[PDB]
A paper describes a structure:
To characterize the NTD ring in the ClpBK476C:casein structure, particle re-centering and focused classification and refinement was performed. This improved the density for the individual NTDs and connecting NBD1 linker enabling the identification of a trimer NTDs form the channel entrance. NTDs from protomers P1, P3, and P5 were determined to form the NTD ring, which retains the overall spiral architecture of the NBDs. Additional NTD density corresponding to the other protomers (P2, P4, and P6) is not observed, indicating they are likely disconnected and flexible. Remarkably, density corresponding to the polypeptide substrate is identified to extend up from the P5-NBD1 pore loop and directly contact the P5 and P3 NTDs. An additional nine residues were modeled into this substrate density as poly-Ala. Based on the molecular model, NTD-substrate interactions are proposed to involve helix A1, which contacts the substrate approximately two residues above P5-NBD1 pore loop in protomer P3 and ~7 residues above in protomer P5. Interactions are also observed between helix A6 in protomer P3 and the substrate. Surprisingly, we identify the substrate entrance channel comprises of an NTD trimer from alternating protomers (P1–P3–P5). We identify a substrate channel entrance that comprises an NTD trimer which binds substrate as a spiral, extending its unfolded state, thereby facilitating transfer to the AAA+ channel.
Author numbering: 4 to 74, 82 to 142
The structure:
Amino acid sequence: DRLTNKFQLALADAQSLALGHDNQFIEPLHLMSALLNQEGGSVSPLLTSAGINAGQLRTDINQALNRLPQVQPSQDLVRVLNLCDNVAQKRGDNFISSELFVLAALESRGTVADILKAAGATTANITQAIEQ
């Protein structure tokens, strides 16, 4: 799609994570976990730059993943990805990058947004990190 190759690869990993954890749906949480674990990925350094502890974030995200029902993208994920698209359009980006997911997730309510807020993420410090 309009997604960067790195973002597409993280999505594939998110699917593997959902499968490996016996979850029926790939949730924004799965995508986030994948992005946090992506060597050379943009998400971890973006968070560190925004003043958010990426290490503790993956722990809280893993805790949330551990709470999901066990038994394929969820509508939650489709929704957040749609906002990523809109955000890329508003910022004038040619493609949808991983950093936008952090911003879109923060503005999409639900568990991931709650975790990000508690971790110190705000539309302001994430947007600043993105522009930087």
